[PDB]
Write a protein that binds this ligand. Structure first.
Ligand SMILES: Nc1nc2c(ncn2[C@@H]2O[C@H](COP(=O)(O)OP(=O)(O)O)[C@@H](O)[C@H]2O)c(=O)[nH]1
Length: 164
């Protein structure tokens, strides 16, 4: 619950909940099936990438909500991609269109989750293209954001941003 931890470029600190991890055979969007440890349970985290911070709520293979501050657009984009991956959202696994390696050249074992993080920080349009949008909030303290990190009347599903 109280410790700052890292998932690569993502920093997290648990707020609530508990996940339990089980290996599952996951179909990724390029057709491969890869065994991945999948977390089950409601969890909520403070999160950070750079100057952008947020609160992430996830359930099994689902980003439920991500509420972030306004920041440098590169950090907003990276926090959102990292939370989409850390969430293990079904849509994120479906977004792998291209080649992805789970062994290195010397045959050593690589972590699927970390390889997915590397994949999407390099290719985020694969994740955004099919993520989905929903109407932004109206008349509130929050606004919606599109995949270009601009305020918009429709927002990436589950994501909202605190008005300055
Ligand atoms: N949802 C959730 N993810 C976690 C937790 N602890 C570690 N992780 C993530 O779980 C994944 C673990 O991947 P990996 O290190 O490859 O370990 P493996 O599943 O044992 O092969 C990483 O994406 C970690 O950030 C947790 O308590 N909850």
């Amino acid at each position: 619950i109280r410790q700052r931890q890292r998932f690569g470029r993502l920093e997290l600190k648990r707020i609530s909940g508990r996940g339990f991890k089980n290996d599952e055979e996951i179909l990724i969007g390029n057709g491969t099936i890869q065994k991945i440890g999948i977390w089950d349970g409601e969890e909520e985290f403070h999160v950070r990438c750079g100057e952008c911070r947020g609160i992430l709520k996830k359930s099994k293979m689902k980003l439920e909500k991500l509420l972030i501050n306004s920041a440098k657009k590169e950090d907003m984009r990276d926090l959102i991609i990292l939370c989409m991956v850390f969430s293990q959202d079904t849509r994120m696994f479906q977004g792998v269109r291209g080649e992805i390696n789970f062994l290195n050249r010397a045959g050593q074992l690589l972590s699927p989750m970390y390889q997915l993080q590397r994949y999407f920080l390099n290719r985020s349009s694969d994740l955004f293209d099919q993520w989905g949008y929903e109407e932004s909030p109206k008349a509130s303290e929050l606004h919606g954001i599109n995949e270009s990190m601009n305020a918009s009347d429709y927002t990436l599903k589950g994501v909202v941003v605190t008005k300055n």
